[PDB]
């Protein structure tokens with residue numbers, strides 16, 4: 001059996017979120033370097 | 043100030059006794075150095091390319107002359123010729139370093155900021171110094187001038203109380219720190235103690251002292267010295283061996299550090315200049331005007347050092363360019379006359395700095411020789427031991 005998932009609200013959000021995250025890598029840890037350059041007297 | 047209201051006779055006998063020319067009277071409290079920036083004519087702040095290129099080219103010419111000579115006669119010359127070429131190269135580089143100090147405070151060529159940043163970095167690297175860290179330490183010095191327990195980026199004196207504490211911890215005057223202080227502030231090596239300053243930069247090579255938003259800028263600052271000491275100090279050695287190192291790099295380096303140390307030490311230290319703690323009477327304007335000593339040199343030396351001795355003017359008008367420092371002083375000497383102190387670089391001054399003014403005691407608020415002070419506080423150690431009878 002299956003519990004009739006498509007008319008629900010927790011499952012719709014978790015479904016959309018899991019699919020979007022599984023599409024492509026989304027972690028951007030190297031873009032934060034701009035946060036170490038806000039003070040430069042050049 | 044230490045010598046308060048008293049006639050001109052005792053002032054002048056103190057003056058010629060210590061080697062100063064004009065001692066200072068007493069400045070009112072509750073002021074700020076930035077006040078007297080209104081006493082300056084507005085034409086003093088103007089930019090001109092003539093003095094700029096002259097200031098960047100004269101010391102370069104002196105350096106090139108010294109190097110051409112030294113290489114023309116590499117190692118066939120006796121030691122005195124080597125000493126003289128080293129002295130010339132050291133002085134030329136002290137001039138270029140004054141230019142770099144100007145670019146660090148953003149007052150050499152403000153129209154092109156990228157160019158002046160690059161120039162300051164380049165001229166500071168050969169002394170193995172960092173430009174951003176230098177800016178920071180100098181600003182911290184200007185904010186805390188003569189403040190006891192806080193002016194760590196200047197010639198903080200060795201006080202009597204901390205010496206007594208170290209002697210109580212050492213259990214005698216024979217420990218390691220004892221002999222270290224003994225030779226560092228009793229022998230002429232004091233005129234090189236600026237090298238200690240050099241090691242206290244690189245604040246442990248520790249990025250945890252700074253504000254995070256500046257990491258990339260600080261790191262870059264440390265990479266210009268290192269690159270030098272990683273790409274150029276090899277070449278020199280590889281092309282001249284130990285001797286070709288000690289005569290081409292180490293001797294000019296020691297001369298430059300002589301200049302740095304003597305300039306600063308004479309600038310902010312004298313028997314009539316007190317070091318008040320914070321909350322206990324420390325005043326900003328009083329310490330920046332009355333607590334400064336101006337050294338006078340021969341005009342050839344001055345033009346070689348880019349007027350590096352004139353420090354008082356650029357503490358009241360921090361944007362005042364380098365070539366307007368002599369003239370500006372003449373202005374202030376007219377209005378702040380009775381309060382300023384002045385001296386001429388002579389042998390007597392340095393002998394007094396080495397042999398007489400060694401320990402600072404705050405009760406008498408003056409400088410006293412190290413040996414008499416330590417034997418006095420040791421006799422009081424014996425007397426408190428007698429007081430420790432029961």
Ligand SMILES: CC(C)CCC[C@@H](C)[C@H]1CC[C@H]2[C@@H]3CC=C4C[C@@H](OC(=O)CCC(=O)O)CC[C@]4(C)[C@H]3CC[C@]12C
Pocket residue numbers: 170241242243244245246247268271275
């Ligand atoms: C070797 C010659 C030919 C080139 C010049 C080398 C310098 C770039 C090196 C050698 C001495 C080094 C310094 C020696 C001592 C220290 C302290 C050290 O940190 C500590 O000791 C932290 C405090 C502690 O350990 O308790 C590391 C940084 C620093 C300034 C070093 C920074 C890099 C320096 C200046």
